[PDB]
Amino acid sequence: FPELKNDTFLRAAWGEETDYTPVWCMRQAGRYLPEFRETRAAQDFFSTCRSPEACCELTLQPLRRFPLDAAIIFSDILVVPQALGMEVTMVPGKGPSFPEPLREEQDLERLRDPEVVASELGYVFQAITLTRQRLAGRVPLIGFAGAPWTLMTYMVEGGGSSTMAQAKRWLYQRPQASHQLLRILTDALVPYLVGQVVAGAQALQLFESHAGHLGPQLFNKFALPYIRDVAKQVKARLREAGLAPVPMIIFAKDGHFALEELAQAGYEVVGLDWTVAPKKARECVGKTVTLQGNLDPCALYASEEEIGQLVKQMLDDFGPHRYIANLGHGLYPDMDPEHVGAFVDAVHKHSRLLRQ
Amino acid sequence: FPELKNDTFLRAAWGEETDYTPVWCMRQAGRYLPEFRETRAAQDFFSTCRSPEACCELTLQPLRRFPLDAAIIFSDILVVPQALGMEVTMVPGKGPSFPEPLREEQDLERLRDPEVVASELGYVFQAITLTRQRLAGRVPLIGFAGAPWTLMTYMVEGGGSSTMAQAKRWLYQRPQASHQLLRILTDALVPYLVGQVVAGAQALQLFESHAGHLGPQLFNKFALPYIRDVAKQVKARLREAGLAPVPMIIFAKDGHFALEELAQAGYEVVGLDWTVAPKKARECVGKTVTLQGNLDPCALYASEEEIGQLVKQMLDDFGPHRYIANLGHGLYPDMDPEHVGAFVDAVHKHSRLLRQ
């Protein structure tokens, strides 16, 4: 692989001082880019996903527009449940969905042995190697997957939900089968994530997007143990394979109650949503971890000038140490690329200014 | 009006010691009751709402089942935007919705002067008087309305949303028109809430269900000032009318970041969701306010025995002072009434036991 030229993101992730605050955006490869829709029209989502060249191209697109300090592989968190044997249908404009979600304990029988998932996801590994080669060391490449509880919500709910009532019903009514499902997911994620690194990923992000539906008690029983197992086992397996561990990020959307624990869960970086105050997250996490975040994506609806001021206040609150700038959630498909540019520019400019 | 016989809920709300922890449930009049669906089939929601006798009956139903320490008037938070001149359609099984949501600043012109809203909502007042008479002082009656920002989300989004992207787009792109809309809502809520009290309501709850989509900064600009204005003006108007103020509750779903401020906003009671730890909410709010909550409604999917244990731990964490037991959100329409009963019984039994 080519030698990394700009490694600011990795240094910040490992806790080291840098000359500026590195920045990237969740969903930087997304529908808000015109070129993204054009390329995705090659067929329909999961049917264009299967092509390494396609996923590479989508990954690179944002980097041609903005001087982002990292690329994230274009994929979907639903590829893991799919590789486990669930069928996904792609509703026209309505998003990826399981038309036959898991509904009772017996439905677990349909799933592949988690040990074979990595081999099902070879195309993803190929897309990572390719992207790493094509970036030619410009910036680091981030691999990613959904966290076990989050993946469970999708598998049980079938898709999106405002309550997660069906999923949490499993936690309360079917606690043993839930633990079994969560172990299967964990057992599949570990080889998938190690594979991403072997294929060329230089950092990993675990997305726990549906954390906030659980209170502290359910989260500690059913989400945390597996968040901890993923990091522990990924690290072990990489060490054994003679490879360098990579910085790992846990993002827990709506997870203010968990932050203190999430700082002790074996991850270099805790990613935050916009509902936690930066200084208060710093209290919860301590000095030992890097924070990432946390701009309200909707803030990008404001004027470039306003975006500039909002970024300045965000940076002032985080301080220059142990910080990777990002949004608090992915970019929405109706955002202006020029405003995304404004966000990237302002992080760079204000973080250098703050340093002086 | 008949003299109140059991006033435990009011005493707890004003901060006084009681012999047990009083309990009620958000959506205690809801689809989980068989008798609720039967009565609601008289026509379709907002068309059965118009009848004082109907709303009275729905209000009383849960009280025939369980020894709840308060009744809450059966209504919908959408009656205020409707009284302001927005049309609601009732999608078959899909819920109340605005088919023509507000989309630009000009749409504000369709709205009635907030000064006439109370007179549009006479049927609600009549349903409160009737219910207060029929309860004959058994337990207090709670009036309620949606909080200005929450009402705004519904009016702009048209209904439910996972991002509130359209609503928050208004906050960032149309800040002045948003402030104007929020003032109209405030100006309508104040006379509506005073009217509920004049008609016989003995406590008021303001529902800020869509708080959690805002971070601290947007919340302080666009939600908090109006939450404060509602309480301030409601109190002033009641004093002037020669009436006793009632305990007022602010419920801010997903509002962990706001709790400290919400304790200073002029409300006797702060209602909490299940994602805040009771002891941590107690820190945030101090000794001056009563907390209400906060059981995960989904916990009612567990066994009666499990519900019992979960209630015990909740009560232990809250402590006996300044506490009204409730769920952290409304009951879901697929809950077992026997499990709701288990929750009520366990609050009563364990709170007496804790006192000994």
XYZ file of C-alpha atoms in Angstrom:
712
model
C 0.000 0.000 0.000
C 1.058 3.617 -0.603
C 2.562 5.529 2.320
C 0.124 7.903 4.037
C 0.800 11.572 3.276
C -1.727 13.270 5.555
C -2.270 11.359 8.773
C -3.760 14.138 10.892
C -6.976 12.132 11.477
C -5.017 9.140 12.848
C -2.831 11.255 15.109
C -5.850 13.073 16.520
C -7.558 9.659 16.982
C -4.585 8.268 18.964
C -4.656 11.354 21.163
C -1.676 13.251 19.781
C -1.348 16.982 19.124
C -1.845 18.171 15.545
C -1.454 21.422 13.577
C -5.189 21.605 12.876
C -8.414 19.811 13.657
C -9.067 17.042 11.141
C -12.593 16.833 9.698
C -14.794 14.281 7.932
C -18.595 13.860 7.528
C -20.845 10.924 8.174
C -22.467 10.123 4.796
C -19.950 12.321 2.899
C -20.703 9.879 0.067
C -24.470 10.500 -0.109
C -27.469 11.678 -2.157
C -26.654 15.385 -1.505
C -23.993 14.955 -4.209
C -25.400 15.066 -7.772
C -22.610 12.726 -8.966
C -23.678 10.221 -6.282
C -27.211 9.824 -7.705
C -25.888 9.523 -11.282
C -23.494 6.705 -10.257
C -26.114 4.976 -8.046
C -28.544 4.919 -11.006
C -26.280 2.200 -12.559
C -28.921 -0.050 -10.970
C -30.494 0.022 -7.466
C -28.363 0.359 -4.288
C -27.446 -3.205 -3.118
C -27.207 -4.182 -6.823
C -24.611 -1.419 -7.479
C -22.928 -2.135 -4.085
C -21.713 -5.543 -5.360
C -19.167 -3.818 -7.636
C -15.796 -2.871 -6.098
C -15.173 -0.155 -8.749
C -18.574 1.432 -8.025
C -18.056 1.595 -4.248
C -14.520 2.920 -4.789
C -15.879 5.727 -7.034
C -18.561 6.699 -4.524
C -15.950 6.746 -1.745
C -13.656 9.095 -3.703
C -16.321 11.542 -4.964
C -16.505 13.752 -1.786
C -12.688 13.914 -1.657
C -12.649 15.524 -5.136
C -14.938 18.224 -3.812
C -13.554 18.979 -0.362
C -10.205 18.591 1.426
C -11.636 16.056 3.906
C -9.076 14.546 6.271
C -10.420 11.025 5.825
C -12.413 8.868 3.441
C -14.995 6.367 4.651
C -15.754 3.310 2.554
C -19.142 3.537 0.925
C -21.248 0.632 2.137
C -24.404 0.076 4.189
C -24.724 -1.269 7.749
C -27.360 -3.664 6.389
C -24.795 -5.754 4.468
C -24.091 -7.821 7.636
C -27.731 -9.002 8.263
C -27.927 -9.568 4.468
C -24.698 -11.689 4.590
C -26.332 -13.565 7.523
C -29.149 -14.597 5.169
C -31.820 -11.927 5.414
C -33.309 -10.639 2.181
C -33.311 -6.873 1.577
C -35.665 -5.065 -0.828
C -34.934 -1.534 -1.976
C -38.177 0.477 -1.858
C -38.169 3.200 -4.607
C -37.092 6.311 -2.653
C -38.165 4.691 0.643
C -34.810 3.004 1.515
C -33.391 -0.502 2.228
C -35.761 -2.751 4.168
C -36.368 -6.333 5.364
C -39.760 -7.453 3.979
C -39.523 -10.531 6.247
C -38.079 -9.260 9.548
C -37.255 -11.632 12.418
C -40.401 -12.015 14.570
C -39.934 -14.956 16.909
C -37.134 -17.067 18.333
C -37.531 -19.665 15.576
C -36.619 -17.091 12.914
C -33.021 -17.255 14.162
C -32.753 -20.605 12.315
C -32.706 -18.817 8.927
C -29.372 -17.157 9.699
C -25.958 -18.369 8.443
C -23.281 -19.393 10.905
C -21.570 -16.058 11.681
C -18.251 -17.751 10.828
C -19.055 -17.616 7.102
C -20.128 -13.952 6.913
C -16.666 -12.561 6.042
C -16.472 -14.789 2.981
C -19.921 -13.550 1.899
C -18.619 -9.958 2.110
C -15.516 -10.369 -0.092
C -16.764 -7.605 -2.432
C -16.513 -5.133 0.433
C -12.915 -6.172 1.148
C -12.118 -5.781 -2.611
C -13.675 -2.298 -2.592
C -11.481 -1.349 0.409
C -8.199 -2.581 -1.186
C -9.044 -0.778 -4.402
C -9.989 2.479 -2.631
C -6.845 2.334 -0.486
C -4.751 1.883 -3.663
C -6.552 4.657 -5.553
C -6.363 7.206 -2.712
C -2.608 6.651 -2.923
C -2.032 7.723 0.698
C -3.835 11.083 0.372
C -5.741 10.558 3.657
C -6.603 7.473 5.798
C -9.473 5.149 4.939
C -12.134 4.318 7.560
C -13.932 0.944 7.545
C -17.233 0.553 9.427
C -20.183 -1.593 10.491
C -23.342 -1.301 12.542
C -23.188 -2.191 16.228
C -24.902 -5.434 17.339
C -27.956 -3.821 19.010
C -28.432 -1.440 16.093
C -28.227 -4.332 13.622
C -30.735 -6.227 15.750
C -33.236 -3.339 15.612
C -33.214 -3.363 11.804
C -33.530 -7.173 11.660
C -36.504 -7.256 14.060
C -38.275 -4.002 13.116
C -37.687 -4.632 9.398
C -36.385 -1.080 8.987
C -36.850 2.302 10.696
C -38.862 2.892 13.881
C -39.605 5.741 16.296
C -40.133 3.513 19.384
C -38.230 0.291 18.637
C -41.204 -1.316 20.399
C -40.855 -4.646 18.563
C -37.091 -4.745 19.180
C -37.385 -3.790 22.899
C -40.297 -6.249 23.219
C -37.673 -8.946 22.346
C -35.357 -7.593 25.082
C -38.104 -7.808 27.727
C -40.114 -10.814 26.480
C -37.313 -12.857 24.804
C -34.129 -11.994 26.742
C -32.288 -15.272 26.022
C -33.049 -15.258 22.267
C -32.024 -11.582 22.146
C -28.692 -12.457 23.782
C -28.307 -15.303 21.215
C -29.075 -12.949 18.287
C -26.653 -10.312 19.686
C -23.890 -12.961 20.018
C -24.432 -14.073 16.393
C -24.141 -10.407 15.278
C -20.989 -9.949 17.371
C -19.513 -13.199 16.040
C -20.135 -11.947 12.477
C -18.886 -8.375 12.968
C -15.503 -9.362 14.409
C -14.281 -11.272 11.309
C -15.920 -8.645 9.016
C -14.080 -5.777 10.740
C -10.748 -7.656 10.884
C -11.254 -8.375 7.142
C -11.743 -4.642 6.447
C -8.400 -3.929 8.112
C -6.597 -6.820 6.337
C -8.027 -5.354 3.099
C -6.620 -1.906 3.890
C -8.820 0.039 6.322
C -6.766 2.287 8.619
C -9.512 3.028 11.201
C -12.865 1.463 12.130
C -16.148 2.986 13.198
C -18.894 1.020 14.953
C -22.290 2.745 14.454
C -24.730 2.368 17.370
C -27.393 4.594 15.810
C -30.276 3.164 17.869
C -28.698 3.444 21.299
C -31.012 6.203 22.477
C -34.129 4.048 22.535
C -32.585 2.043 25.411
C -32.270 3.507 28.878
C -29.162 2.856 30.995
C -30.307 -0.558 32.263
C -31.237 -2.181 28.919
C -28.171 -0.608 27.339
C -25.797 -2.054 29.968
C -27.356 -5.558 29.560
C -27.888 -5.767 25.811
C -25.753 -3.147 23.980
C -22.587 -2.454 26.030
C -21.241 -6.024 26.522
C -21.216 -6.579 22.750
C -19.786 -3.131 21.997
C -16.951 -4.163 24.347
C -16.563 -7.648 22.791
C -16.203 -6.241 19.238
C -13.261 -3.985 20.169
C -11.586 -6.611 22.391
C -11.765 -9.378 19.770
C -10.954 -7.189 16.764
C -7.763 -6.069 18.529
C -6.812 -9.634 19.560
C -7.268 -11.060 16.085
C -5.269 -8.274 14.406
C -2.386 -8.667 16.892
C -2.330 -12.423 16.225
C -2.321 -11.824 12.464
C 0.864 -9.763 12.808
C -1.029 -6.562 11.922
C -1.127 -3.141 13.582
C -4.403 -2.337 15.380
C -6.231 0.694 13.996
C -8.027 3.474 15.899
C -11.593 2.398 16.605
C -14.558 4.752 17.026
C -17.806 4.009 18.845
C -20.659 6.288 17.733
C -23.701 6.083 19.971
C -26.479 8.315 18.661
C -28.561 9.713 21.550
C -26.256 8.050 24.068
C -25.616 10.785 26.640
C -26.384 8.241 29.433
C -23.702 5.858 28.194
C -20.770 8.178 27.487
C -18.913 7.521 30.718
C -19.078 3.758 30.095
C -18.336 4.174 26.387
C -15.037 5.853 27.323
C -14.016 2.601 29.101
C -15.210 0.226 26.357
C -11.879 -0.104 24.511
C -12.308 2.511 21.764
C -9.839 5.338 20.975
C -12.644 7.665 19.909
C -16.204 8.292 21.127
C -18.427 9.876 18.457
C -21.190 12.177 19.664
C -24.497 13.518 18.441
C -25.393 17.251 18.626
C -27.603 16.911 21.778
C -24.598 16.598 24.145
C -22.722 19.825 25.019
C -19.029 19.377 24.071
C -17.754 20.496 27.497
C -20.184 18.183 29.239
C -19.125 15.223 27.033
C -15.505 16.067 27.952
C -16.442 15.718 31.675
C -18.201 12.379 31.051
C -15.345 10.872 29.046
C -12.259 12.286 30.787
C -8.830 12.983 29.282
C -8.087 9.449 28.007
C -10.229 9.450 24.822
C -10.701 11.476 21.665
C -14.147 12.927 20.917
C -15.586 13.215 17.424
C -18.496 15.382 16.343
C -20.844 16.937 16.783
C -22.463 19.533 14.504
C -26.188 19.369 13.970
C -26.301 18.375 10.280
C -29.331 20.666 9.911
C -27.038 23.567 10.770
C -25.830 23.244 7.180
C -29.192 24.712 6.104
C -27.982 28.022 7.474
C -25.840 30.514 5.544
C -22.138 29.825 4.983
C -21.431 32.763 7.310
C -23.685 31.227 9.999
C -22.050 27.794 9.486
C -18.687 29.539 10.028
C -19.832 31.041 13.360
C -21.440 27.758 14.513
C -18.208 25.828 13.782
C -16.157 28.426 15.680
C -18.292 28.041 18.797
C -18.145 24.210 18.470
C -14.333 24.256 18.234
C -13.996 26.664 21.153
C -16.076 24.259 23.296
C -14.115 21.127 22.314
C -10.668 22.732 22.666
C -7.718 21.763 20.472
C -6.712 18.435 22.113
C -8.139 14.983 21.369
C -10.815 16.099 18.883
C -11.956 15.047 15.401
C -14.565 17.366 13.906
C -17.641 15.767 12.304
C -21.408 16.211 12.223
C -23.632 14.614 14.906
C -25.343 12.566 12.208
C -25.066 11.881 8.485
C -25.671 14.550 5.854
C -29.258 14.718 4.584
C -29.835 14.176 0.850
C -31.181 17.734 0.431
C -28.034 19.570 1.597
C -26.071 22.009 -0.512
C -22.531 20.740 -1.336
C -21.288 24.370 -1.049
C -22.457 24.405 2.580
C -20.675 21.098 3.238
C -17.599 22.866 1.801
C -18.152 25.801 4.120
C -18.173 23.392 7.095
C -14.864 21.716 6.080
C -13.170 25.066 5.361
C -14.307 26.586 8.659
C -13.034 23.644 10.745
C -9.598 24.008 9.141
C -9.436 27.813 9.299
C -10.814 28.237 12.844
C -8.729 25.375 14.337
C -5.502 26.935 13.046
C -6.689 30.347 14.252
C -7.568 28.917 17.715
C -4.057 27.414 17.904
C -2.514 30.856 17.411
C -67.273 21.260 42.067
C -67.049 18.257 44.411
C -64.395 18.333 47.132
C -61.287 16.279 46.324
C -61.053 13.045 48.321
C -57.629 11.776 47.260
C -55.190 14.594 46.616
C -51.931 12.661 46.897
C -50.917 13.614 43.324
C -51.321 17.350 44.065
C -49.426 17.186 47.343
C -46.559 15.295 45.725
C -46.619 17.865 42.865
C -46.337 20.812 45.301
C -43.407 19.092 46.983
C -45.078 17.822 50.142
C -44.611 14.471 51.877
C -47.231 11.791 51.225
C -48.095 8.314 52.551
C -47.354 6.699 49.187
C -46.097 7.552 45.734
C -48.956 8.641 43.484
C -49.067 7.112 39.989
C -50.654 7.852 36.612
C -49.816 6.856 32.994
C -49.375 8.928 29.893
C -52.044 7.676 27.446
C -53.914 5.787 30.220
C -56.916 6.434 27.956
C -55.564 4.659 24.853
C -55.961 1.856 22.290
C -54.515 -0.769 24.709
C -57.968 -0.717 26.338
C -60.591 -2.756 24.429
C -63.348 -0.401 25.667
C -61.384 2.533 24.201
C -61.533 1.170 20.626
C -65.250 0.326 20.953
C -66.056 3.903 22.083
C -63.726 5.493 19.478
C -65.512 3.534 16.713
C -68.522 5.897 17.255
C -66.896 7.661 14.287
C -63.228 8.591 13.628
C -61.057 10.311 16.290
C -61.452 14.124 15.828
C -65.115 13.465 14.885
C -65.740 11.644 18.216
C -63.550 14.212 20.081
C -66.162 16.951 19.459
C -68.525 15.314 21.983
C -68.047 16.208 25.671
C -69.762 12.970 26.839
C -67.441 10.866 24.649
C -64.232 12.485 25.931
C -65.532 12.229 29.508
C -66.168 8.468 29.045
C -62.711 7.867 27.587
C -61.151 9.815 30.470
C -62.951 7.702 33.099
C -62.373 4.257 31.526
C -58.812 3.662 32.933
C -59.980 4.767 36.401
C -62.567 1.938 36.421
C -59.758 -0.513 35.803
C -56.956 0.734 38.036
C -56.664 2.862 41.189
C -54.762 5.623 39.349
C -54.035 8.705 41.447
C -55.056 11.095 38.681
C -57.140 11.302 35.531
C -55.948 13.138 32.433
C -58.489 14.617 30.051
C -58.677 12.680 26.826
C -57.775 15.010 23.979
C -55.033 15.368 21.365
C -52.193 17.917 21.225
C -53.222 18.561 17.611
C -56.466 20.326 18.611
C -54.554 23.643 18.993
C -53.098 23.780 15.401
C -56.560 22.597 14.231
C -58.239 25.459 16.212
C -55.661 27.786 14.561
C -57.080 26.793 11.164
C -55.101 23.792 9.981
C -57.037 20.866 8.563
C -56.399 17.405 10.032
C -57.140 14.117 8.235
C -57.311 10.854 10.144
C -55.449 8.182 8.151
C -57.034 4.705 8.759
C -54.713 3.219 11.417
C -51.930 5.656 10.443
C -52.855 8.505 12.870
C -53.812 12.233 12.784
C -51.970 14.229 10.127
C -51.816 17.594 8.315
C -52.206 16.905 4.567
C -51.243 20.558 3.929
C -48.432 21.321 6.403
C -46.921 24.809 6.702
C -44.041 25.065 4.190
C -43.052 28.702 3.827
C -43.427 31.973 5.695
C -46.534 32.895 3.694
C -48.405 29.863 5.057
C -48.608 31.651 8.416
C -51.377 33.805 6.869
C -53.832 30.866 6.988
C -53.795 30.817 10.791
C -56.474 32.381 13.045
C -55.550 35.126 15.471
C -54.423 33.149 18.549
C -56.862 35.262 20.596
C -59.833 33.322 19.197
C -58.485 29.790 19.760
C -60.029 29.316 23.234
C -63.496 29.979 21.851
C -62.864 27.393 19.110
C -62.013 24.831 21.822
C -65.170 25.215 23.950
C -65.942 21.485 23.548
C -62.728 20.670 25.387
C -63.675 22.977 28.271
C -67.153 21.304 28.389
C -65.510 17.862 28.489
C -63.326 19.007 31.430
C -66.265 20.403 33.491
C -68.251 17.246 32.864
C -65.343 14.928 33.759
C -64.588 16.937 36.906
C -68.267 16.630 37.931
C -68.446 12.909 37.134
C -65.207 12.000 38.946
C -66.876 13.552 41.989
C -63.542 14.349 43.675
C -62.155 10.791 43.436
C -58.751 12.032 42.187
C -57.518 15.295 40.548
C -58.000 16.015 36.857
C -55.013 17.003 34.677
C -55.450 19.308 31.659
C -52.757 19.408 28.953
C -51.455 20.766 25.650
C -48.449 20.401 23.392
C -45.522 22.764 23.889
C -44.951 25.461 21.225
C -41.907 23.843 19.542
C -43.577 20.435 19.545
C -46.734 21.916 18.008
C -44.568 23.648 15.416
C -42.918 20.352 14.399
C -46.299 18.770 13.646
C -47.503 21.854 11.728
C -44.369 22.013 9.544
C -43.573 18.293 9.165
C -47.260 17.441 8.675
C -46.972 14.649 11.246
C -44.246 12.349 12.605
C -40.545 12.566 11.713
C -37.264 10.931 12.744
C -35.044 13.968 11.953
C -37.372 16.987 12.124
C -35.277 18.173 9.168
C -38.058 20.340 7.702
C -38.858 21.857 11.110
C -35.170 22.525 11.998
C -34.637 23.846 8.448
C -37.164 26.590 9.453
C -35.132 27.316 12.620
C -31.902 27.761 10.629
C -33.239 29.167 7.333
C -36.335 31.069 8.609
C -35.463 32.146 12.177
C -37.762 35.204 12.274
C -40.812 33.368 10.857
C -40.132 30.508 13.292
C -40.121 32.981 16.195
C -43.410 34.438 14.819
C -44.998 30.958 14.550
C -43.785 30.060 18.085
C -45.280 33.314 19.474
C -48.642 32.560 17.800
C -48.587 29.059 19.384
C -47.694 30.536 22.782
C -50.397 33.198 22.447
C -52.940 30.433 21.714
C -51.829 27.990 24.426
C -52.043 30.492 27.287
C -55.804 31.187 26.940
C -56.442 27.472 26.143
C -54.667 26.333 29.327
C -56.287 29.030 31.507
C -59.642 27.904 30.007
C -58.923 24.280 31.014
C -58.395 25.418 34.603
C -61.494 27.690 34.620
C -63.401 24.628 33.329
C -62.119 22.466 36.187
C -58.596 21.153 35.551
C -56.582 20.851 38.777
C -53.111 20.456 37.178
C -51.607 21.137 33.740
C -49.044 19.269 31.695
C -47.146 20.830 28.787
C -45.866 18.093 26.415
C -42.555 18.887 24.682
C -42.311 15.504 22.957
C -39.931 16.693 20.215
C -37.362 18.397 22.414
C -34.654 15.826 21.771
C -34.187 16.714 18.117
C -32.808 20.116 19.209
C -29.397 20.435 20.799
C -28.813 22.850 23.695
C -28.355 25.936 21.493
C -31.492 25.614 19.316
C -33.468 24.562 22.376
C -32.424 27.643 24.389
C -33.331 29.967 21.447
C -36.524 28.395 20.139
C -38.072 26.057 22.768
C -37.149 27.319 26.269
C -38.296 30.984 26.049
C -41.811 29.869 25.082
C -41.901 27.062 27.653
C -41.135 29.817 30.192
C -43.731 32.246 28.750
C -46.559 29.659 28.953
C -46.060 29.048 32.694
C -45.498 32.744 33.509
C -48.614 33.935 31.657
C -50.872 31.054 32.697
C -50.077 31.841 36.345
C -50.607 35.607 35.884
C -53.963 35.209 34.184
C -55.277 32.751 36.793
C -54.208 35.033 39.672
C -55.986 37.967 38.001
C -59.128 35.870 37.510
C -59.293 35.252 41.265
C -58.419 31.564 40.767
C -55.853 29.324 42.459
C -52.870 28.379 40.262
C -52.512 24.645 39.651
C -49.338 22.524 39.619
C -47.805 22.629 36.153
C -45.665 19.879 34.612
C -43.155 20.270 31.790
C -42.433 16.972 30.009
C -39.458 17.145 27.682
C -38.952 13.826 25.908
C -35.236 13.209 25.235
C -34.333 16.407 27.074
C -31.431 15.366 29.309
C -29.486 18.472 28.114
C -32.259 20.812 29.230
C -33.184 19.451 32.660
C -31.181 21.954 34.670
C -32.846 24.842 32.810
C -36.253 23.153 32.900
C -36.054 23.146 36.713
C -35.851 26.983 36.596
C -38.599 27.473 33.988
C -41.496 28.011 36.424
C -42.960 24.490 36.600
C -43.638 22.519 39.820
C -42.878 19.214 38.112
C -40.363 18.088 35.474
C -41.455 14.919 33.644
C -38.708 12.610 32.415
C -38.217 9.922 29.815
C -36.579 6.544 30.637
C -33.128 7.478 29.170
C -32.181 9.680 32.168
C -31.058 7.887 35.365
C -33.324 9.018 38.251
C -30.392 9.911 40.536
C -28.725 11.860 37.758
C -31.966 13.776 37.002
C -32.154 14.573 40.742
C -28.645 16.152 40.511
C -29.623 18.182 37.420
C -32.860 19.507 38.907
C -31.957 20.000 42.581
C -34.267 19.838 45.605
C -36.753 22.538 44.513
C -38.821 20.524 41.983
C -40.816 17.319 41.791
C -39.824 14.695 39.209
C -42.320 12.525 37.360
C -41.585 9.317 35.487
C -39.893 7.449 34.157
C -40.535 3.773 33.368
C -39.758 2.526 29.899
C -43.290 1.777 28.640
C -41.846 -1.272 26.858
C -40.982 -2.664 30.282
C -44.678 -3.531 30.495
C -44.000 -6.282 27.929
C -42.180 -8.142 30.671
C -43.857 -10.413 33.232
C -45.859 -8.910 36.101
C -43.134 -10.207 38.433
C -40.449 -8.465 36.329
C -42.542 -5.251 36.221
C -42.693 -5.460 40.040
C -38.881 -5.687 40.329
C -38.322 -2.906 37.750
C -40.697 -0.566 39.645
C -38.925 -1.336 42.936
C -35.545 -0.356 41.510
C -37.079 2.813 39.955
C -38.603 3.861 43.297
C -35.390 3.150 45.195
C -33.519 5.454 42.769
C -36.046 8.316 42.982
C -36.438 8.172 46.778
C -39.709 8.988 48.537
C -39.645 12.827 48.348
C -40.880 15.007 45.479
C -41.796 12.173 43.088
C -44.803 11.241 40.938
C -44.493 7.823 39.313
C -45.334 7.549 35.598
C -43.953 5.964 32.440
C -41.303 7.765 30.336
C -43.729 7.834 27.418
C -47.329 6.930 26.629
C -48.613 3.358 26.696
C -48.432 1.562 23.342
C -51.699 0.265 21.857
C -50.493 -3.360 22.087
C -49.988 -3.449 25.878
C -51.777 -5.806 28.222
C -54.136 -3.972 30.650
C -53.186 -6.553 33.341
C -49.559 -5.413 33.048
C -50.629 -1.765 33.357
C -52.422 -2.920 36.536
C -49.265 -4.609 37.751
C -47.378 -1.309 37.310
C -49.952 0.720 39.322
C -50.135 -1.908 42.092
C -46.350 -2.161 42.390
C -45.867 1.621 42.688
C -48.370 1.702 45.558
C -47.102 -1.419 47.342
C -43.355 -0.710 47.012
C -43.655 3.006 47.944
C -45.436 2.137 51.197
C -42.892 -0.627 51.831
C -39.970 1.780 51.143
C -41.496 4.233 53.648
C -41.399 1.575 56.369
